[PDB]
Each structure stands twice: as structure tokens, then as C-alpha cells.
Point group: D2
Chain length 258, copies 4
């Protein structure tokens, strides 16, 4: 099977990567970073995020696995001492799929992005005001720092810091959370996080300023002359290679409780 | 079609109820409060809640409709001036189903409940401490005022006041929110609301005191010698008669924004 | 100097208490639990709370000291291994004063309480609705689970779990926090915690039900036929014997961060 | 008395300003925008903020008054229809003082600012990590979007959106609130807002990146090679001319409740 390994680039990760490649050399496995069927990320969740975005055009043909050389990750959920066991098992597994978020940005005179964690919108030097439209229905006028749209697996990330709910990645949904919304006699937002099912479309529409700083996972870009930002649950899914049970809620416990 | 009408019991509601019955008298419709196929609730959400619990043993055979004589309700979402139009249309509609929550209470030496909004657990005079177990995995030891498990339609109720997320009722899920959790160097809870898919089981297990005040929607009972409280998404669903489009998110907007 | 020692009543605490009494026997110190000038509490914050309430009528004549036999407390902030050192130093110190909360309860056809942590109000079986009046000005109609009024030192307790701010006990103030407030198009509360200076009076006035469950620190009582609940910063203060520097913010760090 | 009037610069405000100047012409009053003793701001809170910062070097010699031509402001708390009455009364009042925040920024190889609302710190393109030090004691390592330090009158502004408490401006204090803090098994912040008395010093110290976007009220500047950011309650106070009673809590009610 064609495979590749990305590394965080520190000593520990590169040596682990060389050792796994050497071990893969003892099996019918071809290193190929152009059309891999297996993508191993060694590092942290940041490293895994880059791996996903490197190959986001071949998601349906790839199964991902993350090894954590630092602390336990939500995506990089296997330990280095288990690398040898991982080599063997991979050589000869079930696949687990998580939902992704599609962001569409439209301009004047169109770009789409795929997120594994979340997409966020803030202003580019000035007050952030957008009209929030759900399935063509005007829902609210949002004034604040910005907004965040999370995938289920993303809910443990930025979404969590914003008071969002944690949702099991088996739920095909996206979650919208507010950043520092203004609420007074005049201005009014829902306050609560909002969880949207598949096929629902959330559109953000500029009121005055049309420039926005938009993020998708790690990447943050200043967009100019924006007419609309559309969020929806993607038709695409990320696929993980599963070798043993490590339940999401146990992953949550291990990361946040103890 | 067999039908019945419950009233809040104030003047406005009883007169509206008598008028609809009179109007139903002009069609092939039989009043029957034992085996109705249609249950009309006239009043508020509290009135609708009682209607649901009155007939919770025939949910699969009943389509519910709520008329709001006071303010707009999430369940009682039609206006009194539309009663005549409702009579006609009902006489000769699509059905919309929402998920429900199953609560199981086990003792020493077993009772099950169905909730349309939520079930909550608090202590009966003393400190509340329970072990939270998700699919047989110990997740956290909760210390605080109590816990709340909400259906999707319930998310706009008690759940919302506790910082929970609002979720579209098309999502088959339940949501657990904390009431005043203690978090310090010693005690540790997740903090965030948790959203569970169908088939996941959340079990609350006593640590010391075994007496608990348990609520299901409007009903609140002191339970004694409790060994376990199990929450899961019910196999049963509530069915609404749908006569026109009134999207959940528009219902949310109308109730909270303007 | 006249002194007494209260114990949590477990083995560790009673033996520590007997040893300190024996050690005090080597100095000019008289055990007197009627008119002590020094009150030593051995146990946890709960034990210290009881010590305070046991002698709340002689606060101006007493200096308190807490020893923690369990985990570190905010009031019981000295370790058992330091008991001998405490005996000596006490025998031959500076005094530190913290603000207290006065609760007044008025009826039909008047009772006052002093709180070291907080006073809370909830309903006694039913919906909680009160009108909140600040210095005779109607501020809001509160609908929810209840309300909590905290002293500065209390801010690390129940107040913290409710999203309240932590405030240095050198600030003569009280802080009002909400429990699960209902906010929609119809009902409206401030949401935010409110911090009141000395001489401001917060009055809670019943709207419908006049029965309330009122707590002051550890004690919780059902009050009947209530006409008003008044909160204000007390003229009285609790006095601590200070033997070394242990800054409030360090106490906060040690208890919550690490 | 020497005086000046600043305007928002819209039609309504300029005409109101010309009319008040004309009316002042009927009294012993000299327009002087260099050394005024009275500064009238006509517009909104933004306009008032600029007025304050225009004259922040003569705060002890100036009494401020705000007129709101748009919605009611916390600083601009008088209505246009009352301009004539204001002219008269000012011609021949009590003074009310609010606390201010001092921000000190130190570099490598020192700048101080005065805030009426708040000062905030965020990163300049990258992860925000700072060590929070209170009176020379290391309190926490903060990871998140940023931090906000509010004056009492500022507590109704940005501070409120971040979950901060509202505090009466008679309390000489500052309040620190978190923006989207990361909390997991590894990283740990207090969570709660923190209220500091006069003479307490809060120092933010860089961990890695030394570039920060720092705001003081309306002004936001990228600071380079920062070694420390110090916050403390200022010795300086803003003085308002008071003509009638308009209690802070009533101002809060009018702005947020109804
Ligand atoms: C910018 C930046 C770094 N912040 C990322 C932190 O969040 C973590 N993270 C990334 N993705 C997730 C995630 N999906 N769930 C929980 N934590 C996550 C990452 O491990 C790190 O702890
Ligand atoms: C890991 C990693 C790489 N950083 C990207 C992730 O950082 C996470 N993040 C950024 N800011 C915060 C934040 N302020 N709190 C928690 N997570 C955050 C966010 O989820 C994003 O996907
Ligand atoms: C006890 C009590 C009364 N509190 C109930 C309030 O919440 C409302 N309520 C009941 N169910 C829901 C609901 N499902 N969503 C939003 N509000 C709801 C009810 O209308 C009323 O406004
Ligand atoms: C309507 C109605 C009947 N009351 C029952 C409902 O009241 C709701 N409720 C009770 N307490 C609160 C509350 N404190 N905030 C918001 N909703 C609440 C809860 O959802 C429950 O189902
Ligand atoms: C009922 C009950 C027990 N909950 C009390 C918990 O809060 C603690 N507590 C009591 N007073 C304070 C306090 N003033 N600050 C922080 N924690 C406090 C006590 O130590 C224990 O951890
Ligand atoms: C200690 C001790 C004795 N218990 C009394 C204290 O418990 C504290 N408390 C009660 N409930 C909670 C709570 N739910 N969260 C945090 N602290 C709480 C409260 O401050 C009260 O003064
Ligand atoms: C950037 C920007 C605009 N946001 C400012 C909003 O907050 C308001 N504001 C400014 N200062 C305060 C303030 N001190 N209290 C409450 N609101 C304030 C201002 O009126 C406006 O409503
Ligand atoms: C008014 C005015 C001028 N804008 C400055 C003020 O805007 C306020 N502000 C900026 N962002 C927010 C915000 N996100 N929510 C509430 N208030 C905000 C902040 O207090 C600042 O002093």
C-alpha cells in the first residue's frame, strides 16, 4: 500500500518517522507522498491538521493516522512506543469517518474551503457587524468580535473556549458560536451556540465593512470585497484508520479531566 | 377523526375550545379524549406539556397541535385567530416528528419516564455528587447543584438558561448541561455542554447520598434509594400535525430576537 | 488570652486539637469557649464557617485562625505541621479584616443574618420570580432558579460556580449573581454579575409566591410569607489573626491553578 | 468659564453645538478649546471617549458632560431637548469622579496610557501566551485570544461582552477578563473575572512572541519588542459635571433592560 509520513520536524518526530519507514521496508509498502492511501502524521494536532490540508483533494482515497510525540491529541491519538505495533497492523483495519465543514466565500465582480476543526470570521481592523441568515431567513444582526463555525471533532478546540458544546463526531452537524457579542436594549443576538444539521445553510452577509479576516483551521486570510460567507456541512468526510477502540468520550476525558 | 382539546382553563382558552368543538361539529369528527388521533392544546407550552404527558402511551397514534392564547410558544405555535382555518384543514396534512428523552431510574431491593423538554437531577437536601458514566466508561465525578438532560426541542428551555446549545430537532440527540459545577485543584468537571447521539447511554451513579429530586418536564419527584439514573434518546417520537411552514429557526428568532 | 478550638471531629483533627491545648498549657492561655479572644478552627472551610457562626455575636472581640487537616482552605489556610509554631506565636500578631453580608428578611403581620460566604434565595417548590430593587429603584424582574449574594471572600465559593467575579476581600462590596435566568422576547434580566459598594441596598420583592428557601452560608431555611429580602454590606467585619504573609491571590492560585 | 464642545460631526450634532454656543453667548462664558474648564461632548459614547482622550492631560481641571443625539449613552447621558436647560445651569453644580486605568508598556533597549473604558491585549498574528503576575507573584500562564482590563465605568462595555461583572464606579478597582482561554489537562487559567483594588499591580509578561496588539479604549496599536505590560488603578480620575440625579444602576437599567 502506498503511504507517507509527515513529521512535526523536531528530533523525536523525525527519528520516529525514519524508524517507521525502515520498518515498513520489511513489508509490501511503497512510500509515495503524491498518491498515498495511508497518511501518518507524527507530532501534535497542528501537524495532523497540516497533513489533512496537504491531501484534502484525495480525502475519499486516504485513511489518516496520528501519532502524538508530545501530549495526547484528539487526532494524533496513538503513542510513539506503539509505532512498531502500528507498522505491523497497517501492513496487513476498520475505517472511521468524521464530518467536515464547507466554507464558501463570494466576492464582487468564489472560493471554497474545507475545515477539520472550524472556520472563523472577524473584521479586518474595525467593528464586526454581519447579518446572519439561516436557510434564506434573516435570523439576527451580529455585533461583536466574530463568529466560529465548528465541526463535531472541532468542538473540543476553539469552539470549546467560546462556550460551545462538545458533540460526538458521529453527529453530522456544525456548530456556530459567538465571540464577545454586544447585547443591549438596541443590539440583540441569540447568545447560545447553535447546532445545525446537514443541508442547513448559514450565510453571513456584510452590513457595512466588506473586509474580513477568515480562518480555516490553521490558515488565516484577509478577504476583500466579500459579499457572502456560506457555511454548511460538507459532503466530504475524513477517514481514519482504526486499529483499536479509543472512544471519543474517553479521548475527551483523557484530554480534559485527567 | 377522533380528537380532543385541552385548555389552559382560563376564559380565553375555554371559549376558544368550545368554538372549535362547535366548528368541528360541522364535519366528520368525533370528540374522544380516550383514543383521540388528534390532540389540540390551547394555552401555552405548559399546557402543551400536560397534553403530551396525558397521552404519552399513545404517541405513535397521535398528532399534536398547539394554539397559543398567551405569548408565542415553541410547541403551541399557532394563533387563536387561525382557529377556524385550523378546523377546516384538520377536517380533511403532513406529520413532523421530534426526538424524546428516556429516563430510567433504578433502586435497591425500576421506573422509566419520557421527556419532551428535559429531565434534571438535584439532591434532596444536601450536596449533590454523582459519578457520570458514558457507555460504561467513567467520565467524571460531578459536584454542583445538579445536571440537566435536554431533548433537541427542549434545548430552548431550561437547557438554554444553563448555557446549553440550541439544536435543530431533526438531530436525534440529547444534551447534558451542568448546574453550578465546582471546579478547583481538587474537583474537576468538563464544564462544557455535551451532545450525545442515539444509542449512547449516560448513567448517573450516587457516590454518597442516594436520595435525589428528579424532574421530567413539569413533574418533580423525590426518589429514594437510587442506584442509577440512565439517560438515552428514546425510540419513541412525538408527532406534530403540520399545516404550513414555520421553521424551527424562525420559531427561535420570533421567541428570542424579536 | 482566652481561646477555644473547634474540630471537624475526625481523628486527625481531634488529636491535633488535644496537642495544641496541651501546648497552650505551657503558656499563659485560658481555654474558654464562652468568651474566647482567639478561635481556632481545625478542619476545612465548613468547619471554619461553623466557628464563625458560633461566635457571630462577638466578632469585634475575636480573632479567627483556621488549620486545614484536609485540603487547603481559603479560611483554614495553615497546615497541621505548623501547629506548634502557631501555638508559640499566638501565645505572645497583626489582624486582618474581611467584609460581611447582612441579610434582612421581612414578613407579614423581621430577621437578620450575617454571611461570611453568601446568602442565596430560591423558591420553595415552584417558579422563582422576584422584583429586584436597588436603592428603591426597580431594576429588573428576575425569573430563574434563584439569586446569590456573595461577600468578597465568598466570591471563590458558590459565586464562582455561577460565573461570578473573584474580588479581593479588601474591597468592601457584595456581588449578586444569577442562577439559570430565563431570557427571551418577554422576560429580561441583566445577565451579568453585579458588584455593589457599601451603603447600597438590594431588595428582593415577591411577585406571586411568597415562600422562599433562603440560605446563609451552610444554613438553609424555608421562610414563609416573605415581604422583602434586603441585602447590604454589613458594618461588622470578621477579624483574622495574621502570622505571616499569604496573599489572597496566592491563596486563589494555590486552590484553583496548582 | 472657559468651555468647548466637540461634535460627532453629523448634522444633528453640529446644529445642536452651534445652538448651545449661541446660547452660551448670552452668558459669561468663553469658548476655548485649549484650556477649557468644561468639555461638552455631543454624539455618542465614542464621541465622549475622544473628548476624554483629547484632554487627558488636564483631567484635574476639566468637568465633562455628554449629550446623546443618538441612543442613550453611559457617558453621554443627557438628551438634546435638555440642551437649553443645560446651558443655563452650567452658566451659573456638583462634580462626580470615576476611576481610570493606567497601562504601562515597557520595551527592550516606556509608554503609559490612560483608559476610561478598558485596555486589551492580543497577539499580532500568532498564538497569544502571557504569564500573568499579580504584585510580583506568578498567578497563571494564559493561553487564548487575549485579555481585557476594565475600569468600573468600562465594565458595561467590552468587559460585559466577555462575561465580566458590572461594578459601581464608586469602587476604585479594575477588572481582568479572559478572551477565549484554553483549558485542558495541560493548560490552566482561573476562568473567572478578577477584580483588583487600588495599588495592586497586574503585569503581563511575554513567553515567546514579544509583539502585541494593545488597545486603550478606541485606539489600537501594534507594539513591538514588549517586555512587560503593567495595569493598575490610576491616581487620576475623570470628573463629570452633575446637574441632576441619574444613578449608575438606573443608567444600566435604561441601557440593558428597557
Ligand atoms: C493556535 C494554536 C494552538 N492551540 C491549539 C490547542 O488546541 C488543540 N487542538 C487542536 N485541535 C483540537 C481539537 N480538535 N480538539 C481539542 N484540541 C485541539 C491543540 O492540541 C492545542 O492544544
Ligand atoms: C492545533 C493546532 C493548530 N492551531 C489551530 C487550532 O487552534 C485552535 N485555537 C485557536 N485559538 C484557540 C483558542 N483561543 N482556544 C482554543 N483553541 C484555539 C483552533 O481550534 C484551531 O483549529
Ligand atoms: C416553571 C416554569 C415556567 N418556565 C417556562 C418558560 O419556558 C418556556 N418553555 C417551555 N418549553 C419551552 C421550550 N421548549 N422552549 C422554549 N421555552 C419553553 C415556557 O413557555 C415559559 O416561557
Ligand atoms: C412551560 C412550562 C412548564 N414549565 C416546565 C419547563 O420550565 C422550564 N424551566 C424551568 N426552569 C427554568 C429556568 N430556570 N430557565 C428556563 N427554563 C426553565 C423547563 O424547561 C421545564 O420543562
Ligand atoms: C455544600 C458544600 C460543599 N462545597 C464547599 C466547597 O467549596 C469550598 N469553600 C467554602 N468556602 C469557600 C470559599 N470561601 N472559597 C472557596 N471555596 C470555599 C469548600 O472548601 C468546598 O471545597
Ligand atoms: C464549605 C463549606 C460548607 N458548604 C457551604 C458552602 O458551599 C458552597 N457551595 C454550595 N454549593 C456550591 C456550588 N454548587 N458550587 C460551589 N460552591 C458551592 C457555598 O459557598 C456555601 O457557602
Ligand atoms: C467598536 C465599537 C462600538 N461598540 C461600542 C458599543 O458599546 C458602547 N459603549 C461604549 N462605552 C460604553 C460603556 N462604558 N458602557 C456601555 N457601553 C459602552 C457604545 O455605545 C456602543 O454601544
Ligand atoms: C463606543 C465606542 C467606541 N468603541 C470603543 C469601545 O467599544 C467597546 N467594544 C469593543 N468591542 C466590543 C465588543 N465586542 N463588545 C462590547 N463592546 C465592545 C469597547 O468597550 C471599547 O471601549
Amino acid at each position: 500500500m502506498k503511504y507517507m509520513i509527515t513529521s512535526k520536524g523536531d528530533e523525536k518526530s523525525d527519528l520516529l518517522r525514519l524508524n517507521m519507514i525502515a520498518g515498513f521496508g520489511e513489508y509490501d509498502m511503497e512510500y509515495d507522498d503524491v498518491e498515498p492511501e495511508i497518511v501518518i502524521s507524527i507530532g501534535g494536532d497542528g501537524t495532523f491538521l497540516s497533513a489533512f490540508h496537504q491531501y484534502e483533494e484525495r480525502l475519499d482515497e486516504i485513511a489518516f493516522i496520528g501519532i502524538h510525540t508530545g501530549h495526547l491529541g484528539f487526532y494524533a491519538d496513538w503513542r510513539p512506543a506503539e509505532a512498531d505495533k502500528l507498522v505491523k497492523l497497517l501492513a496487513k483495519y476498520q475505517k472511521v469517518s468524521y464530518p467536515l465543514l464547507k466554507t464558501t466565500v463570494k466576492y464582487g465582480i468564489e472560493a471554497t474551503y474545507l475545515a477539520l476543526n472550524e472556520s472563523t470570521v472577524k473584521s479586518s481592523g474595525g467593528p464586526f457587524v454581519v447579518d446572519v441568515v439561516i436557510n434564506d431567513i434573516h435570523f439576527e444582526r451580529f455585533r461583536g468580535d466574530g463568529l466560529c463555525m465548528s465541526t463535531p471533532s472541532g468542538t473540543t478546540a476553539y469552539n470549546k473556549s467560546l462556550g460551545g458544546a462538545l458533540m460526538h463526531p458521529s453527529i453530522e452537524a456544525m456548530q456556530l458560536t459567538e465571540m464577545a457579542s454586544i447585547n443591549n436594549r438596541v443590539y440583540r443576538t441569540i447568545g447560545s451556540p447553535l447546532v445545525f444539521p446537514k443541508h442547513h445553510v448559514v450565510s453571513l452577509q456584510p452590513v457595512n465593512d466588506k473586509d474580513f479576516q477568515i480562518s480555516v483551521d490553521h490558515l488565516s486570510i484577509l478577504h476583500r470585497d466579500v459579499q457572502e460567507i456560506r457555511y454548511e456541512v460538507s459532503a466530504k468526510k475524513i477517514h481514519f484508520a482504526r486499529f483499536r477502540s479509543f472512544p471519543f468520550w474517553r479521548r475527551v476525558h483523557d484530554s480534559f479531566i485527567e
